Design an enzyme around this catalytic site. Structure first.
Site, PDB file in Angstrom:
ATOM      1  CG  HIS A   1      -1.884   1.101   0.941  1.00 21.19           C
ATOM      2  ND1 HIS A   1      -1.719   2.327   1.926  1.00 21.19           N
ATOM      3  CD2 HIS A   1      -2.764   1.350   0.491  1.00 21.19           C
ATOM      4  CE1 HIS A   1      -2.479   3.206   2.440  1.00 21.19           C
ATOM      5  NE2 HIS A   1      -3.320   2.727   0.986  1.00 21.19           N
TER       6      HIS A   1
ATOM      7  CD  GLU B   1      -2.945   2.877  -4.078  1.00 23.86           C
ATOM      8  OE1 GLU B   1      -2.667   1.219  -3.420  1.00 23.86           O
ATOM      9  OE2 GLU B   1      -3.571   3.551  -4.349  1.00 23.86           O
ATOM     10  CG  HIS B   2       0.351   6.756  -0.664  1.00 22.62           C
ATOM     11  ND1 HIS B   2      -0.482   7.497  -0.436  1.00 22.62           N
ATOM     12  CD2 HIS B   2      -0.350   5.051  -0.649  1.00 22.62           C
ATOM     13  CE1 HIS B   2      -1.464   7.214  -0.155  1.00 22.62           C
ATOM     14  NE2 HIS B   2      -1.299   6.000   0.985  1.00 22.62           N
TER      15      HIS B   2
ATOM     16  CD  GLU C   1       3.263   9.744   0.079  1.00 25.28           C
ATOM     17  OE1 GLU C   1       1.748   9.677   0.152  1.00 25.28           O
ATOM     18  OE2 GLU C   1       2.694  11.542   0.184  1.00 25.28           O
TER      19      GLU C   1
ATOM     20  CD  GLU D   1      -4.810   6.620   2.983  1.00 23.97           C
ATOM     21  OE1 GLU D   1      -3.046   5.974   3.475  1.00 23.97           O
ATOM     22  OE2 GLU D   1      -4.877   5.733   2.613  1.00 23.97           O
TER      23      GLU D   1
END
Lengths: 438, 85
Positions: free
Chosen positions: A49, A52-53, A122, A129
């Protein structure tokens, strides 16, 4: 009769799969990868994940800003998602912007910077999140459902990963993950809509030819999960709506019972009080629930993985004093899959599914998702004729045999969120998985 | 002071996650030997005095009274019995 899905390979082992539609003007091209969070261990859980960022944070050539501009100039958009077993990166564009989009996707996948400065930036975005998924109740429920059903196993892990890992993920382990997993034999380049197959194969030879091959190339959609009957209760009296999921161990993509389980799922079906037609549905549970106002909605699911699945139902209800009735009547309808179903329900559900499996594919993105999913789980696109034959082969008596070994008197995984005081203890729920009268 | 399922009369509950596993998935007698020896010993030790003190006192009282009564109705206890009545 839809146009045939063309399939080619490269030398490295990259599959190219395409379905052209000369009636549309847009094209979805993308890369489906047979890899996801399940490929992480406990220490690097969250890496997939995280990547992906950073895939959109800049490459060796284009900076983050140049990347933004290049896509803006193309006119379409890029999108990505990481699941437990599958990663997707696609680009929707105009017909003649397809070579640009393939080039951008090839760049972000192979030649991403993963600069320490961007990792650090990030690391906060992703931390935030963790505290905002909390609102997406369905996602909360399904993530706890996996966590408990596959307790302490790779499928039980979340995609985001724990807070601790987010703080400690390095560019080294990011690089290692994508080098080990994003190999040519695990990847499918997919084109749907206004794409020429021969053009797409050439673009693949130009951009994806220097992809690593894995040491031991297994076929696409190659995997032992040990289901745990268990419950998670997240009681919150301040919420107005209860969200409840109940599941049993379901079927894998390549199970012989794959279609049997889909038919069983369609017999229970879905319900939503906000849809006008839902009060008139044929499903027995739908009738019970609507007549008695037991729920706002329910949704049957049959989720598949490479080596296991979850089959069950997701319920939402404001009727906090009749949660017991809702759950009771739901599990009694499941009991009837074992005891009572005949050709009447089965032939009805088969009729509904024969269309449903085709209806779902209504835009280029849905078509690309279908090609990509099937190629990465089954190793091939199954033609509608084959699917029609497999559905037709399901008899009432296959459904009964399947339900008797999969549902009847079996352990469930149960997650309740919200005002769930009325949800009885595990035993009383699990006792409804059989009928003393039968 | 008690409602029913769905409105039991609890203060609002929030922030507690509860977990458990199926009876079919669990060993019902897990840790039985440890419990039977160590837990019982702890449980018994902490309550021992509340039983021992009253039992021993009232048993002592009874023992003294019954022995005196027995002695009073022997030949030797004749004189003491005459006074006691």
């Amino acid at each position: 009769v839809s146009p045939k899905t063309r399939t080619s390979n490269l030398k490295n082992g990259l599959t190219i799969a395409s379905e052209s539609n000369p009636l549309v003007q847009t094209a979805t091209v993308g890369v489906w990868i047979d890899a996801g969070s399940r490929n992480e261990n406990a220490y690097n859980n969250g890496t997939a994940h995280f990547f992906e960022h950073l895939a959109f944070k800049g490459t060796d050539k284009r900076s983050q800003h140049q990347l933004e501009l290049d896509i803006e100039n193309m006119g379409g958009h890029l999108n990505a998602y990481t699941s437990r077993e599958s990663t997707v990166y696609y680009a929707k564009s105009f017909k003649d912007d397809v070579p640009k989009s393939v080039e951008i996707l090839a760049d972000i996948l192979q030649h991403s910077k993963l600069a320490e400065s961007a990792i650090d930036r990030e690391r906060e975005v992703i931390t935030r999140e963790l505290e905002e998924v909390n609102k997406q109740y369905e996602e909360v429920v399904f993530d706890h459902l996996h966590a408990t059903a596959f307790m302490n196993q790779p499928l039980g892990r979340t995609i985001l990963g724990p807070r601790e890992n987010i703080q400690t993920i390095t560019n080294t382990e990011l690089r290692k993950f994508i080098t080990e997993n994003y190999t040519a034999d695990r990847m499918v380049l997919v084109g749907a809509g206004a794409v020429d197959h021969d053009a797409l194969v050439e673009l693949a030879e130009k951009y994806f030819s220097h992809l690593p091959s894995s040491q031991s190339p297994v076929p696409l959609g190659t995997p032992i999960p040990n289901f745990v009957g268990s419950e998670v209760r997240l009681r919150d009296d301040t919420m107005p709506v209860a969200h409840i999921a109940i599941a049993v161990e379901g079927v894998s993509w390549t199970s012989e019972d794959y279609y049997t389980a889909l038919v069983a799922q369609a017999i229970i079906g879905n319900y939503d009080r906000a849809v006008g037609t839902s009060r008139h549905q044929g499903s027995r549970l739908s009738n019970i629930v609507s007549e008695n106002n037991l729920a706002n909605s329910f949704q049957s699911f049959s989720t598949s993985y490479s080596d296991t699945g979850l089959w069950g139902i997701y319920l939402t209800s404001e009727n906090t004093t009749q949660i017991d009735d809702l759950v009771h009547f739901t599990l009694k309808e499941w009991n009837r899959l074992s005891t009572s179903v005949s050709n009447l329900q089965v032939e009805r559900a088969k009729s509904q599914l024969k269309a449903g499996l085709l209806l779902s594919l209504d835009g280029t993105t849905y078509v690309a998702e279908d090609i990509g999913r099937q190629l990465t789980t089954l190793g091939r696109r199954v033609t509608p004729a084959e699917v029609e034959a497999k559905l037709e082969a399901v008899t009432e008596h296959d459904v009964r045999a399947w339900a008797q070994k999969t549902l009847y008197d079996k352990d469930i995984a149960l997650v309740g969120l919200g005002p769930i005081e009325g949800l009885y203890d595990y035993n009383r729920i699990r006792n409804d998985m059989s009928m003393m009268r039968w | 002071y008690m409602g029913w399922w769905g409105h039991m009369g609890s203060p609002p509950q929030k922030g507690i996650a509860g977990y458990t596993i199926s009876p079919f998935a669990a060993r019902p007698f897990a840790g039985v030997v440890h419990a039977a020896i160590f837990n019982t010993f702890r449980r018994t030790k902490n309550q021992a005095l509340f039983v021992i003190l009253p039992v021993s006192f009232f048993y002592y009282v009874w023992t003294q009274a019954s022995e005196k009564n027995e002695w009073l109705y022997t030949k030797a206890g004749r004189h003491e019995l005459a006074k006691a009545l």
